[PDB]
Ligand binder design. Sequence first.
Ligand code: NA
Length: 93
Amino acid sequence: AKKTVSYVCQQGKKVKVTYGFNKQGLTTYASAVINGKRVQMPVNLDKSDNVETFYGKEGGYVLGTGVMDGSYRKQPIMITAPDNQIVFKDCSP
Ligand code: NA
């Protein structure tokens, strides 16, 4: 099961993100279209905690958000590039 959310961020940047959900109701990935290219970021269970979910791996793009269940449309997000610069900042749905 997929669900898509459109966001507006700092400096007017816009991004659409698609979240995958398994049969347990947990998210498995976040897929963001960045310069026209689909960037799929797998959920990072080692880095996720009671307040924040992270998607992505070292060397790739990394998405950070709140706790995601079928909650997900009310969460803010941020996306950091491989160089560690926050390229989508303070994003709201
Ligand atoms: Na980069």
